[PDB]
Structure 1
Amino acid sequence: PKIHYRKDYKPSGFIINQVTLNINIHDQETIVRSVLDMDISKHNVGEDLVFDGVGLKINEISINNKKLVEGEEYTYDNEFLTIFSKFVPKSKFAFSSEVIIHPETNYALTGLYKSKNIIVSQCEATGFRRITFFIDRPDMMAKYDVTVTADKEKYPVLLSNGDKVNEFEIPGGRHGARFNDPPLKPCYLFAVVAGDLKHLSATYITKYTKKKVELYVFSEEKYVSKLQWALECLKKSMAFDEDYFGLEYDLSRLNLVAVSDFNVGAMENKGLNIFNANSLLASKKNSIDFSYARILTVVGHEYFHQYTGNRVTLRDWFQLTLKEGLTVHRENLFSEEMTKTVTTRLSHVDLLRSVQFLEDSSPLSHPIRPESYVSMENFYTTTVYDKGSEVMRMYLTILGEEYYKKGFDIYIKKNDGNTATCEDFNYAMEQAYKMKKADNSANLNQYLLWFSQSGTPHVSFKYNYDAEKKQYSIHVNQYTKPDENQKEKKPLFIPISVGLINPENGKEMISQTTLELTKESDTFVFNNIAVKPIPSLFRGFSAPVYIEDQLTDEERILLLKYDSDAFVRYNSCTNIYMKQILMNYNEFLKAKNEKLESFQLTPVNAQFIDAIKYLLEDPHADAGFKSYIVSLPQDRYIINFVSNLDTDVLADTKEYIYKQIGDKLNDVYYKMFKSLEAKADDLTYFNDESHVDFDQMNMRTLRNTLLSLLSKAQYPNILNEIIEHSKSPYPSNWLTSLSVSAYFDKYFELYDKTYKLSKDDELLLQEWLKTVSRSDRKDIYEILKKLENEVLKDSKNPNDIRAVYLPFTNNLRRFHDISGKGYKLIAEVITKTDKFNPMVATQLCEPFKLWNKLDTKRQELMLNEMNTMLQEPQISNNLKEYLLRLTNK
C-alpha cells in the first residue's frame, strides 16, 4: 500500500491543457471517449507517461491519432496506464482513449454511478480516474469540453460544467448536449448528471456587476415540491458572500441537484453542485425541523466553495483544510447570521468538543494538515473540517472583522484562478496582522503550528486579586499531551477572548479584550479593577482547547445566570455538570468494585438546580439555550475525562443526576411544556415552504426535550400528552412521540402509526428509521432485527444503512452490552457494507473510535471485533488502513 507524503510534493512532468469528452450512456454500459491535449512540462525528465485509471475497460488508446498496442507500447494494470517514454512525444501532443464503464453496478458511489434513475458523478478526491484516464491530482488544471448522449425518454435532462452550447437529436431515440467550460479547473470538480429531473428556478442579480444568474434546483419528479427552501437558501448564500466578503458569482448559471444515493452531504462541482437528497429536500409535512438548518448550511457550504475551493483551489490533497476548514468557517458565519440564534454557535462547539476531541485523543489523531495518507476517502475528517474551521475562525478573532476582511480579500485577489497552499492563507492573514499591529516586524510564523501539531491543547488558569491595589491577574498555562505525531509539543498562538464580570451586579468591568497567549505560560495583569471579578474565559469558544477554568461552582452559577456570552454561560453549566458526573461516577464505580450493600451518592448542587429553574422561568431567556441547560453533556464529551470508562456506571451516573434534577423541577418542566405549545406549534405558516422560523423551531426543541425528561420520569399522566403529541402535524413532534413512548405500553402502537405516516416519503422514512434506532427500548435488538427484515432488507442506499444502525450505537446501555453483541452486530454490518461501499463501511466504524477509552473488558470485546474485521480476506483498502491505524497495528 503506497503512502503519500506531504514533503514529497513535486510538479508533474506533463501538462494537460484541454479535455474533450464524449460520454455516451447506454442501457448496459457507458462509453467514454476522451482527447487530452497535453504538453511536456519544464520538470519533465523523459519519464514514462503514467495515467491514473481505475476499473476501466480499454477499447483503444492513441497518441496523435496513432493507435497504441498493449504490451509493446503500454501496459495497464486496472490502476495505472503506463505509456513507455520512447513512445511519448517531446512536444505538444494529443492522447486519446475510449473506455467502457458501468454506472448501473457502481455501488461505491464514486466515479460515474446510477442513483435510482439518475446518472451522476462524484469525482472528489480521486474519482475522475474511474471515468477516464487522467493525471488525477488537483494541480493538473485544464479546460473542459464535454458532450453527453443518452436515451432521451429516460434521460431528458443532461448537465455538466460550463455553458450548454449545443443540443441535438440522435437516431434511435437518443439526444446529446455539449457543455464548454473555458476556465481552468482540476478534475475533481468535473461533474455530469443525466436524468428525468424536474426543477424550480429563479434569477439572481448580483450586487455590483448587476449580472443575471440563473438558479436551478433539481430533483426526481416525485419530490419536486420539496425544492423551495433550498432555492431560498441559495439566494441567501449568494447575498451573504456579497454582503460580508464582497464576492459575487462569476457564471451565468448555478445548478443544484438532489440524488438519493450519496456518500456524504454534498459536492461543490463547478456550476453543478450535487447533494444527498437529505441535505437539499424538505417540506414542512415531510421533514423534521433539523432538515431546515441542514439544507441552509450545506447549500451555503457548497456555494462558498465557489471561491474557497473552486476559484482558489488546492495544490495537493494535503491542503484539504485550506478549502474545507475555510469553507466550514464561512458556512458557520453565514448560518449564525441567518438563524440569529445563540444555539447555532453552541451546536458547532458541542460537535467539536465531543466528536472531534474524541478523534484527537484517539489513535487516529492527526493535525489539520496531515503529513501522510494512504486512502483519500478516509481523509475527510472532523479534524480537517471542524478543527480546521476553528483554526480559520481564530484568525477572525485575532484580527477583528475589519482586518480579517482585509486579509481575506488579499488571499482572494492574490490566488484567484490558481492553486494554493495553507501557507498562502497564513501569509495573507499575516499582512493584515502587520497592518492591525502597525508593526511590519509582526508575524504569524507561530500560527502555522495550528496546521502541523496534532492533539487538543489544555489551557488552565490561576487568579490573583489585590484589593488594595485594585489589581487583578490571570495566570494562564497551555499544554498539549505528546502523541504519535510529536514527542515534544510546542506552545501555540492561542487567542483568549475574555470579560470580567462584577459579581455584585453582573456587569462588564472591562472592554472587549482578546489575550494573545504565545508562550507556555503568561500572566495578564489588569489595573483599576474595583472589585474581585469572576472571569469570563474563551468567550465565543475562542480557541479549540480543553478549558480548565478553576472556578468554584458558586462562580460558575453566577456566570450561568449573569454573563453576557452565550458560550461561557453554556460552558459554566457544562463544567458544573462534569464535576457532578465525575464525582457520582466514582461513587458508583467504588460501590460496584467493592460490592457494597449500601453507599452514599453526593446530591446535585441545590443552588445549581435553583439557577436552572431561574433561567427556565425567565420569559426573556432563549428557548434553544434552555434546552441545552437541562441536557447533560454528550457521552462522547464525557469520555475524554474518564479513564477506563465503564459505560454501565456512566449510564447509572446520568440516570441519578437526571432523576435528582427532575425530582425538583418536573412540575416546572410540565408547566413549560404546556405553556410553550401555542407558539411552538403555531400552524400559521405550515403551508409556506419559504417561511422558516429558527426561534420557533428552538421552542419545539425545548418542548420535545422536556417531554423526554418527563416521560423517562414517568410523570403522572404524561402518556396523555404523548398521545396528543402524536397527532401534531409537525414531524419533529410526532416522531418525538414515538421515541418518548418507549417507556410506555403504547410504543408499538405509535411505531405503526408513525410508520404509516413516514413510509411514502423516502427521506421521512429514513428519519423514522433513525427514531426507532435510537429508541430507549429494552427490546432494541429484537426491534433492529424487525427493521432489517421488514424495512431495510438488502438496501445499498447509505442513508438507509446509516439511519438503521448509527443512532443505536449511541445507546450507552444497550450498544455497549457487556456480552459484546452490539459490537458484533455493527462489525457484521461494516463487513457486509464494505463489499460494495468501502467509504460508508469506514463511516460505520465510528463507534469503535473510543475503544481504548472504555473499561478493559469492553476494550477487549471491541478489539476482538476489529481484529475479526481485519482478518476478512476481501477487506477493502479503506477499511483495512482505517482499522490498522485505529488498533495501533
Structure 2
Amino acid sequence: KIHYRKDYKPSGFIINQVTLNINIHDQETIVRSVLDMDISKHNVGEDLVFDGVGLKINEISINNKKLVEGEEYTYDNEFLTIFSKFVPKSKFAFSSEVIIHPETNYALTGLYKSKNIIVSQCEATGFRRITFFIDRPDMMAKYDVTVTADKEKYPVLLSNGDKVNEFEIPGGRHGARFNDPPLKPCYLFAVVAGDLKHLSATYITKYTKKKVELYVFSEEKYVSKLQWALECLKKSMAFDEDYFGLEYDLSRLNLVAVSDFNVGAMENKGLNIFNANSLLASKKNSIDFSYARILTVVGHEYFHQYTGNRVTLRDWFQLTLKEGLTVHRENLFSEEMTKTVTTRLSHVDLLRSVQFLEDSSPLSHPIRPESYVSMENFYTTTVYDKGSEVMRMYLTILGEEYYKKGFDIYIKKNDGNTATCEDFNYAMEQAYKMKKADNSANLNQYLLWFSQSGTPHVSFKYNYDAEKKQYSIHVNQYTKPDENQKEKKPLFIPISVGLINPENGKEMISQTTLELTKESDTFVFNNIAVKPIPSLFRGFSAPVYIEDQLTDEERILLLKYDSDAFVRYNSCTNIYMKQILMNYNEFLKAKNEKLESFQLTPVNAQFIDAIKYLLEDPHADAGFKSYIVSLPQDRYIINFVSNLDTDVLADTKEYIYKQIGDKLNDVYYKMFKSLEAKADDLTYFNDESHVDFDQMNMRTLRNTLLSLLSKAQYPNILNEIIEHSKSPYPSNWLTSLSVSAYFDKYFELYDKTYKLSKDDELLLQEWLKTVSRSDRKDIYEILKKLENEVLKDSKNPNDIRAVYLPFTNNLRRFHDISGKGYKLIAEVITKTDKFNPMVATQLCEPFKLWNKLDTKRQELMLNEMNTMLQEPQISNNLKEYLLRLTNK
C-alpha cells in the first residue's frame, strides 16, 4: 500500500487511556491491554480497525464482553477489524490479550530480546507488534503500564513515567507499575527488563531548580563504560538551558544500552534506548570516534524531548520536522562542546558525499516526501542531514538573536501538541518579519526546501572596476529536473560571504549574507579598494553544489589566508577535484585508446607548497591539517563523473597521492614524530570525564600521516608501525593493523590486535571494521576467515555491518570487474533479509550509485539487484527499496 501525504485525515476514533500488563515468561510474553476509547467528530460509522502485526489472540472484548471471531471481528495478522455494528457510539473500552515472543524477534522491532535484555523499539510503527492500536502519531493517549517478570533474570524493570508500585509475585517473579499521565504517541512507548547495572547523578535545572535523576544502564560487564554518556547527558541538559532556555520537565531520565539495535538510539520519553556502540566507551576499549559519537547521540535523543516529544508529529510525512531540527540542535551542541572546526567540516563532508549521492540517485526525495510504502526505509540521510541543513539555514538567515526568538515562538505555540513543517516555517517567518522590520516580509518561497528534491547548483561570475572601486558577484542557481519535479523552482538560498584582500589577507567587508531568491542576481559592492578574492558560502551556508569558478591561484590564497574553515577546506577540495577530473580523463583515454605512452598533468606545485606551509604552521589546527592531506571522498568524487570507471579512479587517486608524497613525505614523517608527545599524552587515560577533542584530532593527523607514509613505503616506516601497535590507545593500535597491510607483518598484527579486542564486544566490532577496510589484495580470503572464525551466524547488526560495510568502500577490490564483490554483498543482504529486513536494506547502500558507474559495472550491479528481487521470500522492505533503486 502507498501512503500519500495529501491523504491525511484524522481518525474516526480516539484513544484516551492505555492500560498495559506485559507479562514476560521464558517461552512467551503475554500482553493484556485495555484501551479507553471514544468516537471522534470525524467518525462516519466505519469499522473499528486496529493495527496488529504478528499477534496471537487469546481474547478480545468490548466493554468486558468477549468478541467472537468471524461474527464480530476478523484478524489477518496485520489488521484487526471489528465490524461497525458492534462498535459502541460513545465512550467504550476495548480490551485484548495477545501472545508475542521477543525471544525469537530477530528483526529488532516491537518487543525483542537483545542478549539477556528485553527491550522495545516502537518508532515508527512497531507498537502494533506489541498489541493492537491505531498506530499513528496523532493518536495521543495516557499510559499506565505494568511489567512482570522472573526476578532473578529481570531485576530491573523500566517503562515511561513514574514508577508507582513495585511488588512480589508467587513463583519467583516481580512486577512494576509505571504511570505516565502526559499524552504521548505510541511510538514513544518503551519497556526494558534485565539484569542492568547503572551510574547515576542528580541534575538541578537552571530556572525552576527542579531535581532530575539521571540514570545510565548497561549489562554488568560493561558498567565501567558508562561515565562519558552521563557527562554528555549533563552537557546536553545545560546546553538546551543555555542556548534555548529550555529545561527538562520530568523527575527522571534513563539511558539504556543494548547490544542489538537497528540504528544509533531512540528518544522514548524518559527512557532513551541506545545501540551500545553509541552509549558505551572507555579509553582502554574504544577508539577516539566513540567519544564524539556518544556526545552526538546522547545529545540528539535529549534534544528530542522538546523537538519531537513535547512538540510531536501529526503524521510521518513531517518526520524531518523532528529529525532535521534535532540534528540541527545536536550540531549546535557538538560544535559548542568540541570547539574544533572539524566538527562542522565532518558534517558537510558527510552531506556532500552520502546525501548528495542519494539526491542524484533514483532514490532522490525531498526532505518531506509525498509518499511512502515502508516507514522503515523512510529514515534517510536526506530527511536527517539535508533536513538539518535546511533547519540550520533559518539560523543563518535570521542570525542568533532572531533565530532564538523564532524557535521559542515555535515551542511556546506548539508545546504539548502535534505539528507540521508549516508550523515551524510560520514561527521562523514571524522572526523574519521582526528582523526586516515589516509584516510584508514572508518565507513562502522557503517552503520549497521541504518539497523540492535534488541538490541545487550555484555558480558565479565576477567583475571588478578598479577605477570605480566597484565589485560585482553574479550568481546563478539551477536544480536538475528529476522524477519529483519536471520544472525546478528557484529556492531561497542564503550565501554567507566575505571578500579577502589578496595583498594582506584582510577582510574587506563586514559579515554579509546574500539572499538569492531568483534564478539569478547580481550583487554589487562599492568602495572596494582593490580586486578581492571572494570567500563564498562561509560555514557552508546552503546545501548546494558550489561552482566558485576561481582559479587555483585564488583558491590557494583562500586556503592559506581566508578566515572561514569551510571555505579554506572547500578551496582545497576544489583544487583536488580539478586535478582528479583532469588525471581521470587522461588515464581513461589511455585505457580506451590502449596507448603505449601518454602524459599526466602533474599536481600544482604551488598547491603542494601551500599544503606544506599549513602543515608546518604550529598554530594551525591538527584536524584541519588531516583534511587537507586527504583527497575528497570517493562518493563525493562520483557526483562529478559520468560512467565512472572505478579502476581508473583508483589509478587517478594513486597518482595524485604519490605526486604529493614524493614532495612532502619528509614533512609528513617529521610531523608524525613531533606530534607524538601531545597526541598520545597518557595524563588523563584513566579519567573518563576528561575528553580532549584537540588531542584526538592530533591522533587523527598522526594516523592519517602514518597511513600516507606506509602506502609510500617510506624508509623504515615499519619500525614506527610496530611501536604504534604498542600504544594504549585503540585508535593507534588499530591504525597499526590497517597500515601494516602493506607489509609482511600484517597477520602478526592481525592476531595481536585480535587478542586485544576479542573480550570487549564493541572493541571486537571495531577490530572487525579495521580488518574489513584493510587495503589487502587477499581481502576476499580475509573476509572468509572473518566469517568462519569470528562473525559466524551472528544476527547482531553491529557484527554484520562491521564485517562488510567498510569493505564495500574498497574502491579497487569491492568493485572488482568480475562482480564478485557485488555477488558477496548481495548474498549477505539476502541472508540478512530473512531475519532483519531493515538492516538488510541498510546493507544495500553500496548499490545506491549503481547507475553512475561504467556500463560494465552497472550491468553487474543491476544483475545482483535483480537476483535479490527474484528471491521468493524477499521482505517488503527490501523489495520496495530495490524496486525504487532500479526504477521499476
TM, length-normalised to structure 1: 1.00
* 1:884 positional shift: 0.2
1:766 deviates by 0.1
Structure 1: how far apart are the matches of 2:429 and 2:799?
46
Displacement, 1:571?
0.1
Shift of 1:410: 0.2
2:485 corresponds in structure 1 to 486
- CA distance in 1: counterparts of 2:33 and 2:231, whole angstroms: 38
Per-residue Cα deviation, 1:542-581 (whole angstroms, up to 9, x for no partner): 0000000000000000000000000000000000000000
Distance across 2 between alignment mates of 1:50 and 1:651: 56
How far has the Cα of 1:882 moved from its partner? 0.1
1:9 positional shift: 0.0
CA deviations over 1:61-107 (Å, ceiling 9, x no partner):
00000000000000000000000000000000000000000000000
Distance 2:103 2:350 in 1: 36
Cα shift at 1:618: 0.2
Aligned to 1:201: 200
Q: Which residue of 1 aligns with 2:872?
A: 873
For residues 350-409 of structure 1, the C-alpha deviation after alignment (integer angstroms, 9 at most, x for no partner) is 000000000000000000000000000000000000000000000000000000000000
Mapped partners of 2:377, 2:159: distance in 1? 27
The residue number in structure 1 matching 2:295 is 296
What secondary structure is seen at the aligned counterpart in 2 of 1:806? helix
User: 1:309 Cα shift?
Assistant: 0.2
Q: Matched residue of 1:727: which SS?
A: coil
Distance in 2 (CA, whole Å) between partners of 1:526 and 1:468 is 13
Q: How many Å separate the matches in 2 of 1:102 and 1:176? A: 19
Q: 1 CA distance for matches of 2:303 and 2:369?
A: 24
Q: CA deviation at 1:485?
A: 0.2
Shift of 1:457: 0.1
CA distance in 2: counterparts of 1:888 and 1:268, whole angstroms: 34
Q: CA deviation at 1:252?
A: 0.1
Shift of 1:269: 0.0
Cα deviation, residue 336, structure 1: 0.1
The C-alpha deviation readout for 1:683-717, integer Å capped at 9, x for no partner, is: 00000010000000000000000000000000000
CA distance in 2, matches of 1:464, 1:583: 27
Q: CA deviation at 1:603?
A: 0.2
Quote how far apart the aligned CAs of 1:56 are. Answer: 0.1
Q: Deviations over 1:272-329 (max 9, x none)?
A: 0000000000000000000000000000000000000000000000000000000000
After TM superposition, give the deviation of residue 838 of structure 1 in Å: 0.1
Correspondence for 2:699? 700
* CA-CA distance at 1:202 after TM superposition: 0.1
Partners of 1:729 and 1:722 in 2: CA distance: 14
Q: CA deviation at 1:57?
A: 0.1
The CA distance in 2 between the partners of 1:368 and 1:460, in whole Å, is 23
Give the unaligned 5+ runs of structure 2.
none
Give the drift of 1:746: 0.1
Query: Deviations 1:709-766 (Å, cap 9, x if unpaired)?
Result: 0000000000000000000000000000000000000000000000000000000000
Q: Give the whole-Å Cα distance in 1 for the aligned partners of 2:268 and 2:810.
A: 37
Deviations 1:118-158 (Å, cap 9, x if unpaired)?
Answer: 00000000000000000000000000000000000000000
1:199-237 deviation line (CA, Å, top 9, x unaligned)? 000000000000000000000000000000000000000
Mapped to 2, the partners of 1:358 and 1:196 lie a distance apart of 43
Structure 2 residue matching 1:603: 3-state secondary structure: coil
How far the C-alpha of 1:793 sits from its partner, in A, is 0.1
Structure 2: how far apart are the matches of 1:639 and 1:105? Answer: 41
CA shift for structure 1 position 510: 0.1
CA distance in 1, matches of 2:817, 2:747: 27
CA distance in 2, matches of 1:219, 1:686: 22
Report the number of matched residues. Answer: 888
Aligned partners of 2:552, 2:621: CA distance in 1, in Å?
A: 23
Question: In the alignment, what sits opposite 1:585?
Answer: 584
Q: Secondary structure in 1 aligned to 2:590?
A: helix
After superposition, the C-alpha distances for 1:493-546 in whole angstroms (9 at most, x for unaligned) are 000000000000000000000000000000000000000000000000000000
Give the superposition deviation at 1:253: 0.1
Q: Structure 1 residue 639: deviation in Å?
A: 0.1
Deviation by residue 1:398-449 (Cα, 9 ceiling, x = unmatched): 0000000000000000000000000000000000000000010100000000
Q: Distance in 2 between matches of 1:761 and 1:404?
A: 44
CA deviation after TM superposition for structure 1 residue 458, in Å: 0.1
Is 1:737 matched with 2:736? yes
How far apart in 1 are the matches of 2:533 and 2:264?
Answer: 42
Whole-Å Cα distance in 2 between the matches of residues 448 and 637 of structure 1?
Answer: 27
Structure 2 CA distance, aligned partners of 1:145 and 1:516?
A: 51
SS of the counterpart of 2:459? strand
Q: Cα distance, 1:855 vs. partner?
A: 0.1
CA distance in 2, matches of 1:211, 1:21: 29
Deviation at 1:480, TM superposition (A): 0.1
| Structure 1: distance between partners of 2:777 and 2:801 | 21
Q: Does 1:221 align with 2:220?
A: yes
Structure-2 separation of matches of 1:157 and 1:207: 30
Please give the alpha-carbon distance, in whole angstroms, between the structure 2 residues aligned to 1:469 and 1:852. Answer: 50
Q: Which residue of 2 aligns with 1:836?
A: 835
| 1:752-783 per-position Cα deviation (integer Å, ceiling 9, x unaligned) | 00000000000000000000000000000000
Look up the SS of the partner of 1:28 in the other structure: coil
Is the partner of 2:49 in helix, strand or coil?
A: strand
Identity %: 100
Q: Which runs of 4+ in 1 moved over 4 A?
A: none
**For each residue in 1:652-676, what CA deviation from the matched residue of structure 2 results, as whole angstroms up to 9, or x when unmatched?**
0000000000000000000000000
| Partner residue in 2 for 1:238 | 237
Rounded Cα–Cα distance in structure 2 between residues aligned with 1:305 and 1:620: 38
**Pairs within 5 Å for 1:58-457:** 58-457=57-456
CA distance in 2, matches of 1:703, 1:31: 55
2: CA distance between counterparts of 1:225 and 1:516?
A: 51
1:471-500 per-residue CA deviation (whole Å, 9 max, x = no partner) reads: 000000000000000000000000000000
Q: How far apart are the structure 1 equivalents of 2:134 and 2:697?
A: 49
The residue aligned with 1:497 is 496
CA distance in structure 2 between the partners assigned to 1:43 and 1:157 by the alignment: 42
Q: Distance in 2 between matches of 1:511 and 1:675?
A: 38
